[PDB]
Structure 1
Amino acid sequence: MTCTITCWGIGVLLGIMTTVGLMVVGWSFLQGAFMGVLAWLIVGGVLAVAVC
């Protein structure tokens, strides 16, 4: 691999960034985490397929 894991690692980092970003602008930790989980699955999944 060495690229799918990196893309997966990029997605989870973006998910954490989107998690704290929503908390700063309001929202809640649980609501922000779900979007972070969603961002990790979507962006990480898209990257794992779009770029290899």
Structure 2
Amino acid sequence: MTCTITCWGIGVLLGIMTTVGLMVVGWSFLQGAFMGVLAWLIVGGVLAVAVC
């Protein structure tokens, strides 16, 4: 691997960014975290599949 795990790491890092980014513009932690979790699975999953 060493690339699928790395791409997964970018996804979880983006989810943390998405959570705090949405909290800055309002929203709430749980509302922001849900989109952060959702962004982790989609973007992280796509990156691991689009490029290996």
The TM tier, using the shorter chain, reads over 0.9
Percentage of matched positions with identical amino acids: 100
Aligned length: 52
Per the TM alignment, residue 47 of structure 1 is displaced from its structure 2 partner at its CA by 0.4
Q: What is the Cα-based RMSD across aligned positions, in Å?
A: 0.3
Per the TM alignment, residue 24 of structure 1 is displaced from its structure 2 partner at its CA by 0.2
Q: Where in structure 1 are there 5+ consecutive unaligned residues? A: none
Give, in whole Å, the separation in 1 of the partners of 2:49 and 2:24.
Answer: 31
| Off by >3 Å, runs of 4+ in structure 1 | none
Note the alpha carbon deviations across 1:4-48, whole angstroms, 9 max, x for none. 000000000000000000000000000000000000000000001
- State the TM-score, normalizing by the size of structure 2: 0.98
Give, in whole Å, the separation in 2 of the partners of 1:34 and 1:43.
Answer: 14
- State the TM-score, normalizing by the size of structure 1: 0.98
Q: Where in structure 2 are there 5+ consecutive unaligned residues? A: none
